[PDB]
Every structure is written in C-alpha cells, then in structure tokens.
C-alpha cells in the first residue's frame, strides 16, 4: 500500500493550449531492455537500507513496537546519502520488516543502531546471525566487519 508519488491529475491546462513552453534541462532517460528493471531493483534494495535503519533501531523494546514506529510519519528517514532518491514517500501500516536481511549497497556515513552494528561493535556476531538467514558459517569468525 505504497503512497509514493502524489499527483492527483488536475489537468486544466491541456484543455487550453497556446501556453508558453518552459525551456529547461532534459532527462533523456532511455529504458534499456534489461537496465530499466535493474534501476528499480537497486531502488527497492536501497529502500531496504533506509527502511531497516529506522525500523530495527527502535525494536529493542521487548514488549511492543507499534506506537513509536507508527509515529514516524515524518520523512526525516527518506533523506539518505549516496544513490538516487527522488521526491516520493512511503507511509505504510504493515510492519513486517524483521524477516528479510540487509543488503549493503551504500558504503557511506549516516546509519544507526542495527545497521552500524555490523561495522564497529563486536556484538555483530550476534547481530549478523540474526541479519542473515538461509546461510551459515558463523562459528569460526571472531569479531565483525562488513565489506
């Protein structure tokens, strides 16, 4: 139930032509057969990195995780670091983001609590085990760092 792009098509101008055309820069985006999908597949994968940052950090409460997570309607989360992020939104009510694992595509600053815990603190051995599912190999490693 995404509420990403808001534009209630109010199109009074196309009824009345003879309107001075605005000269601006062009996108010229060519949706290549395979690449057009891949761009969106990176965005949703980047969206996980933004979504996991806020959802997992406030989930240290042992009893509940609705009242605080439902409160963050503000888009402070939407502001990110590196790759493409456009003026959309993502106000949802599902909250089942604990199942899938984090996919690190963005290697820059501005993370918090759970996402950073892979990089710095030793607790990552416990975190990584939770973060990764379907894959094993965690016994041998000492300390934690994500590349």
């Amino acid at each position: 139930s995404r509420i990403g792009l808001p534009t209630v098509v109010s199109l009074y101008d196309l009824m009345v032509p003879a309107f001075i055309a605005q000269n601006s820069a062009l996108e010229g985006a060519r949706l290549s057969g395979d690449l057009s999908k891949a761009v969106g597949r990176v965005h949703q994968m980047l969206g996980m990195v933004a979504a996991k940052d806020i959802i997992s950090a406030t989930h240290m409460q042992s009893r509940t995780g609705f009242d605080p997570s439902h409160g963050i309607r503000q888009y402070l989360n939407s502001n990110s670091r590196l790759v493409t992020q456009m003026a959309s939104k993502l106000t949802g009510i599902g909250l089942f983001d604990a199942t899938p694992q984090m996919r690190i595509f963005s290697e820059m600053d501005t993370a918090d609590y759970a996402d950073m815990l892979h990089l710095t603190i030793f607790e990552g051995l416990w975190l990584v085990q939770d973060a990764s599912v379907c894959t094993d190999n965690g016994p041998i490693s000492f300390l934690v760092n994500g590349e």
Partner: peptide, 8 residues
C-alpha cells in the same frame, strides 16, 4: 492547477 507525475 498543473501537476501530472502519476499521469506519466
């Protein structure tokens, strides 16, 4: 009144 992001 002119905005049509969802149209495209």
């Amino acid at each position: 009144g002119q905005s049509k992001l969802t149209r495209l």
